[PDB]
Amino acid sequence: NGLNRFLMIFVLLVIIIPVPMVFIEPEINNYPDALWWAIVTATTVGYGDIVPVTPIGRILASIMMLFGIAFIGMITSTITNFFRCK
Amino acid sequence: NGLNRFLMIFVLLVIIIPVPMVFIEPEINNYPDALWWAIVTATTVGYGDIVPVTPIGRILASIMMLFGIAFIGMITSTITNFFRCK
Amino acid sequence: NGLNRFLMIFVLLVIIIPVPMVFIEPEINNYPDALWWAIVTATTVGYGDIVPVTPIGRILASIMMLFGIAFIGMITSTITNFFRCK
Amino acid sequence: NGLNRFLMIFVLLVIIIPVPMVFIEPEINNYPDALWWAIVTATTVGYGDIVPVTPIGRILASIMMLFGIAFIGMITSTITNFFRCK
Ligand SMILES: [K+]
Ligand SMILES: [K+]
Ligand SMILES: [K+]
Ligand SMILES: [K+]
């Protein structure tokens, strides 16, 4: 249940956070562009095609990155502890 | 056998996925450009020189990223559990 | 106490290092721009919107990256060893 | 001795690989620019300021990325197995 609780809140961020981003950012004008940026930021790829200019968007992006690196550590723990037990 | 099964399906993506990408994307016009992008997307480097514009290409890129971060966790588990035994 | 000591020195960098960066770099002209770059460099996202041109800034950025990848490994160890105990 | 052998070959790549890169790439014209790119590629940051255009440089960059993600897994294993034993 510990793994499911960590991914459900992560999936919600990658779905809920792209919604306000469209309105506050002058570069983003629709949800598909913000959703694509969300995946890119959450997977720590960062192409640089879409970048938050406003400080409000930069604070929101920092949360996505902090939860993005934590997601990598959560997936790693799901495989590492799976073979360590037996 | 668990590690080999996870990497063979990963290598398959970085080989098969660059093929449709060339045709659907107007930016990519040849396989060497799409293959280079595939490694960059999988290793979670993301330079931003090659970016999927079409939504079809963006969905395909998301799979490459999800399997890309999972690959990092698979390589980490291969070293962490190796010394954990003894 | 081992985890707290590793993150307090990390957070210190993402707070202290953006200060000299503003003065030595001609691209950066204020702290909010350098602070945003610091989080992006530490989380290993790297958009490329802000880049160190001077060699002094490039040496400082390398420390942020080395401590950035070490931070990913520290968060992973905090979850992997948590369930490994029992 | 296992950890030292993995980092000495990695440090060598980030020092030796930037040397041929300067000559084969028309974008790179000196060692400090190629050395900066090497750190960026090895730490999986990828700003996109410096990108390999030639296929020769793209093959060399792929090795740096494969050894770059493996370096993250090596540093993680050095901390995870340090607390797991006791
Ligand atoms: K980038
Ligand atoms: K990256
Ligand atoms: K990364
Ligand atoms: K990047």
In order of their start, the domains of chain C are 1-86 (1.10.287.70)
Residue found by looking up tokens 């309105």 in the block: A23
Record the resolution, in angstroms: 3.3
Find out whether B74 and A79 touch, Cβ atoms under 8 Å: yes
Which residue in D has a C-alpha nearest to residue C49's C-alpha? D47
Q: What span, in angstroms and rounded, lies between the C-alpha atoms of D49 and D36?
A: 10
The half-sphere exposure of D71 on its side-chain side, counting CA atoms within 13 A, is 26
Q: Angle, to 10 degrees, between the axis of helix B55-84 and the axis of helix B31-42? A: 50
Residues with Cβ–ion distance below 5 A, ligand 1: A 46, 48; B 46, 48; C 46, 48; D 46, 48
Nearest to C48 among B44, B48, B76 (CB): B48
Q: Is the distance from CB of C39 to CB of A65 less than 8 angstroms? A: yes
Q: How many CB pairs under 8 A join A and D?
A: 7
Nearest to B80 among D47, D66, D80 (CB): D80
The token duo for B79 is 């070293």
Exposure string of B36-66, with b = 16+ CB inside 10 Å and e = fewer, is bbbbbbbbbbbbbbbbbeeeebbebbbebbe
Separation of C41 CA from ligand 4 center, angstroms? Answer: 9
Of chain B, the end-to-end C-alpha distance in Å amounts to 20
d(CA C61, CA C18): 10
Helical spans, DSSP H, in chain B: 2-16, 18-24, 31-42, 55-84
Is D56 in a helix, a strand, or coil? helix
**Method for structure elucidation:** X-ray
What residues of chain C lie within 8 A of the CB of A81, using their CB? 80, 83-84
Of D48, D76, D80, the CB nearest to A48: D48
Judging contacts by C-beta atoms under 8 Å, the chain A residues touching residue C44 are 44, 69
Q: With helix as H, strand as E and coil as C, how does chain A read?
A: CHHHHHHHHHHHHHHHCHHHHHHHCCCCCCHHHHHHHHHHHHCCCCCCCCCCCCHHHHHHHHHHHHHHHHHHHHHHHHHHHHHHCC
- CB neighbourhood size of D85 (10 A): 7
Show residues of chain A in contact with C82, CB under 8 Å.
77
Ligand 3 centroid distance, CA of C45 (Å): 6
DSSP character at residue A46:
-
CB spacing of C47 vs B47 below 8 angstroms: no
